Amino acid sequence: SVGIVYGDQYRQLCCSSPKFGDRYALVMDLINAYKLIPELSRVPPLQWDSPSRMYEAVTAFHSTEYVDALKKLQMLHCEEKELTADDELLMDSFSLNYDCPGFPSVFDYSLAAVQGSLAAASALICRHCEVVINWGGGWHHAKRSEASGFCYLNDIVLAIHRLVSSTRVLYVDLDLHHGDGVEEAFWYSPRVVTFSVHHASPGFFPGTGTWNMKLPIFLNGAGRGRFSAFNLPLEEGINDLDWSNAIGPILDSLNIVIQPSYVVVQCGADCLATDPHRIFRLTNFYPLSGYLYAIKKILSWKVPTLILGGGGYNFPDTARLWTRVTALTIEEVKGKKMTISPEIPEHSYFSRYGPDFELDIDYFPDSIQKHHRRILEQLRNYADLNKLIYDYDQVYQLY
Numbered sequence: 219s220v221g222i223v224y225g226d227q228y229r230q231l232c233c234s235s236p237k238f239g240d241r242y243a244l245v246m247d248l249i250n251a252y253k254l255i256p257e258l259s260r261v262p263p264l265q266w267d268s269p270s271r272m273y274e275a276v277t278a279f280h281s282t283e284y285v286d287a288l289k290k291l292q293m294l295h296c297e298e299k300e301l302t303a304d305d306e307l308l309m310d311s312f313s314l315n316y317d318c319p320g321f322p323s324v325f326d327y328s329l330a331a332v333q334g335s336l337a338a339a340s341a342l343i344c345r346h347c348e349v350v351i352n353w354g355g356g357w358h359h360a361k362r363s364e365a366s367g368f369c370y371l372n373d374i375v376l377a378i379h380r381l382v383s384s385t386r387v388l389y390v391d392l393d394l395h396h397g398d399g400v401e402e403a404f405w406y407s408p409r410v411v412t413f414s415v416h417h418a419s420p421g422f423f424p425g426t427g428t429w430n431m432k433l434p435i436f437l438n439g440a441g442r443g444r445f446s447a448f449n450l451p452l453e454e455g456i457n458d459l460d461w462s463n464a465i466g467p468i469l470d471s472l473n474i475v476i477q478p479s480y481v482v483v484q485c486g487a488d489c490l491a492t493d494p495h496r497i498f499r500l501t502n503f504y505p506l507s508g509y510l511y512a513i514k515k516i517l518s519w520k521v522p523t524l525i526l527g528g529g530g531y532n533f534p535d536t537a538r539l540w541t542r543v544t545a546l547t548i549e550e551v552k553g554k555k556m557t558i559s560p561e562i563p564e565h566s567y568f569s570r571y572g573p574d575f576e577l578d579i580d581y582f583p584d585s586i587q588k589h590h591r592r593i594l595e596q597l598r599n600y601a602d603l604n605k606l607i608y609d610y611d612q613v614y615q616l617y
């Protein structure tokens with residue numbers, strides 16, 4: 219089946235942050251408004267038998283001191299008094315500040331995404347689901363002891379750790395931003411191949427995933443993980459077709475050579491032409507959306523796959539995209555036509571889809587060849603180092 223992570227408390231917690239507001243509610247309520255819920259298997263978020271068991275799960279990646287600090291941040295933001303200077307310094311030492319502020323539910327909110335994506339991994343492992351979706355997860359910037367980019371706990375790393383320890387995993391990051399936290403976690407691990415496509419330019423967050431600044435070279439992993447971290451930085455303005463042609467052959471070659479046991483896809487929606495970032499020009503169009511082209515290709519591999527959320531700051535349009543991603547997954551996996559009306563159905567958040575109330579977003583539409591050459595050589599090097607065999611010319615022909 220196709221699983222999807224939701225529940226009543228989970229929804230309250232995913233909607234409890236200042237930055238992402240009620241986005242999760244719009245997403246799940248649009249999927250429900252389109253009558254997709256009866257097609258899907260609800261995956262309940264994971265819950266633990268003790269604080270010690272929760273800490274054991276979370277500190278598989280994060281340091282205990284960082285988890286302790288994130289929990290203290292929540293407790294302090296649940297009292298009226300201001301923080302002491304010592305507590306400000308403590309939070310500064312974990313970057314729990316500026317773009318990663320505290321709020322009264324910051325730990326419960328961050329932990330919830332971990333609970334969802336770990337439960338999603340488990341459903342794939344025990345083969346209850348062939349694909350699982352978690353639109354409350356995808357927080358790819360969080361590091362072992364550092365919050366970053368409004369990501370406080372890295373649910374993706376923790377899910378991938380569960381999958382690999384249950385084996386090779388292919389991680390695909392479609393967000394506008396470089397998936398640096400996941401890349402870094404698995405920098406020395408050849409069994410987790412990471413691939414991020416993103417915008418990169420001077421001063422643009424987080425700054426990695428591109429030529430490294432001697433002449434600038436492309437770092438790609440280290441130790442036994444050399445060649446195992448892949449990146450495709452793109453300049454602004456790219457449309458559906460060109461983004462699709464940019465990553466299509468890379469994805470297909472990665473599946474052919476890696477032969478992964480699991481695929482984890484981060485599907486951050488901030489590449490949409492209508493996102494307030496206004497960098498890329500992707501759509502949710504479905505006759506083609508770069509997102510739907512990528513997800514359809516990945517699902518055609520028939521590999522157990524985790525689909526996560528991530529960025530996306532135009533909430534109605536992020537719901538518009540992820541609702542189509544969800545319908546496509548049902549169609550590809552179950553083999554069962556999904557007929558979505560081009561008009562937003564009436565439901566609690568119908569008014570947020572003004573003024574036209576259509577499912578299509580309100581948008582009217584050499585450097586990549588060099589990257590493909592570089593990426594082909596890296597995949598060959600990765601295959602060489604890891605004693606994987608594959609038709610070189612059949613792979614080279616994909617590009």
Ligand SMILES: O=C(NO)c1ccc(Cl)c(NC(=O)c2cccc3ccsc23)c1
Binds near residue numbers: 317359394486488494
């Ligand atoms: O998604 C991220 N990583 O995958 C990510 C990480 C850090 C930041 Cl700073 C942003 N974006 C904004 O904070 C933002 C920028 C431009 C306009 C607007 C409107 C609402 S938020 C926003 C994104």
Ligand SMILES: [K+]
Binds near residue numbers: 392415
């Ligand atoms: K990305």
Ligand SMILES: [K+]
Binds near residue numbers: 404406411412443446
């Ligand atoms: K890696």
Ligand SMILES: [Zn+2]
Binds near residue numbers: 393394
């Ligand atoms: Zn992003």
